[PDB]
């Protein structure tokens, strides 16, 4: 019900990440502010590890199967 040349981004963004026209990722980065210190660390959105901070080695996020759970001590910038 559409052409394969330019589909809309509304039609595009609902698709699976492999079956797109030009395959590209969806996962992102963000900066982590935990007030034990004031340094931010770039933590990838899917953990696979128990991640702690730079100096205040406590926690930043917990591993899941999918998206990691930022353990509530965070406001963040997705850049």
């Amino acid at each position: 019900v559409q052409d394969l040349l330019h589909p809309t981004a509304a039609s595009e963004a609902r698709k699976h990440k492999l079956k797109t026209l030009v395959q590209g990722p969806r996962s992102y980065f963000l900066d982590v502010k935990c007030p034990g210190c004031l340094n931010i660390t770039t933590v990838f959105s899917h953990a696979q590890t128990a991640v702690t901070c730079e100096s205040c080695s406590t926690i930043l996020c917990t591993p899941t199967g999918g998206k990691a759970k930022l353990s509530e001590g965070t406001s963040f910038r997705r850049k």
């Binding site: 007030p35 034990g36 406590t58 926690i59 509530e72 001590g73």
Partner: peptide, 18 residues
């Protein structure tokens, strides 16, 4: 209500880890 309650109780959080 609710979000401030989370703020203070998890401030006993930052005294609960540290």
């Amino acid at each position: 209500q609710e979000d401030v309650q989370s703020s203070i109780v998890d401030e006993d959080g930052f005294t609960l880890v540290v």
